[PDB]
Swiss-Prot record:
This is Cathepsin K. Keywords: Cell membrane, Disease variant, Disulfide bond, Glycoprotein, Hydrolase, Lysosome, Membrane, Protease, Secreted, Signal, Thiol protease, Zymogen. The keyword Metal-binding does not apply. Disulfide bonds join C22-C63, C56-C96, C155-C204. It is an enzyme of class 3 (hydrolase). GO terms for biological process: bone resorption; collagen catabolic process; extracellular matrix disassembly; mitophagy; negative regulation of cartilage development; proteolysis; proteolysis involved in protein catabolic process; thyroid hormone generation. The active site is at C25, H162, N182. Predominantly expressed in osteoclasts (bones). Expressed in thyroid epithelial cells. GO terms for molecular function: collagen binding; cysteine-type endopeptidase activity; cysteine-type peptidase activity; fibronectin binding; proteoglycan binding; serine-type endopeptidase activity. Thiol protease involved in osteoclastic bone resorption and may participate partially in the disorder of bone remodeling. Displays potent endoprotease activity against fibrinogen at acid pH. May play an important role in extracellular matrix degradation. Involved in the release of thyroid hormone thyroxine (T4) by limited proteolysis of TG/thyroglobulin in the thyroid follicle lumen. It is linked to Pycnodysostosis: A rare autosomal recessive bone disorder characterized by deformity of the skull, maxilla and phalanges, osteosclerosis, and fragility of bone.
Length: 215
């Protein structure tokens, strides 16, 4: 039987979130990866705080964009990241208000998958769990997605502009794919998710900026 995994079935994925009017996709991607590792390492997870990252990761630009590795590094140096409940998302950057009392996860580093390698990415998803990735999500066809395995030849792998989360991989109707968790609400795509073409020459640059935190 062909290799495939869907971490949503295993309880490694929390409900789909909505960024609102803030370019915080990176924060949600990071938090999603941390959540997956919490489930993996401790047997249970909870919603982590993307707001904590938006406000405290000085190396990023808050609602103006950021990198997942920068967030992981921050969680590590900071000795922690608050839970969503302790540090709720307001969708706008504010002053860093982290509080150790509400710490909900820790990080011991991170690893970046070899750029452009879907085979290494697949191994990471299979051996680590959900991984943070970035893609070109500017196409109109990406935005109005609803079903099937998305693939658009004009998707620019050299223009990563949206962080997302690879929650698994498989095949649907002879079409190999990556299971992708977005942060545009459950209203977007298929209940907040999108099936993206796998092994279609790094479509949309799916393997160009992938990483996972070490816990
Ligand atoms: C989306 O939420 C943001 N994307 C982002 O941080 O992209 C990386 C650096 C490729 C992960 C941006 C922030 C504002 C401009 C548009 C989308």
């Amino acid at each position: 039987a062909p290799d495939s995994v869907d971490y949503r079935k295993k309880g490694y994925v929390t409900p789909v979130k909505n960024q609102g009017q803030c370019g915080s996709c990176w924060a949600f991607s990071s938090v999603g990866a941390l959540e997956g590792q919490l489930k993996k390492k401790t047997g249970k997870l909870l919603n982590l705080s993307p707001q904590n990252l938006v406000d405290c990761v000085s190396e990023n630009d808050g609602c103006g964009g950021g990198y997942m590795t920068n967030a992981f590094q921050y969680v590590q140096k900071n000795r922690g990241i608050d839970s969503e409940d302790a540090y709720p998302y307001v969708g706008q950057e504010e002053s860093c208000m982290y509080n150790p009392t509400g710490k909900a996860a820790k990080c011991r580093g991170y690893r970046e998958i070899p750029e452009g390698n879907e085979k290494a990415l697949k191994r990471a998803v299979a051996r680590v769990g959900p991984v943070s990735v970035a893609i070109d999500a500017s196409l109109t066809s990406f935005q109005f997605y609803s079903k099937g395995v998305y693939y658009d030849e004009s998707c620019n792998s050299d223009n990563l502009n949206h962080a997302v989360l690879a929650v698994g991989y498989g095949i649907q109707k002879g079409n190999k794919h990556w299971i992708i968790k977005n942060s545009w609400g459950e209203n977007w795509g298929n209940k907040g998710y999108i099936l993206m073409a796998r092994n279609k020459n790094n479509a949309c640059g799916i393997a160009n900026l992938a990483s996972f935190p070490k816990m």
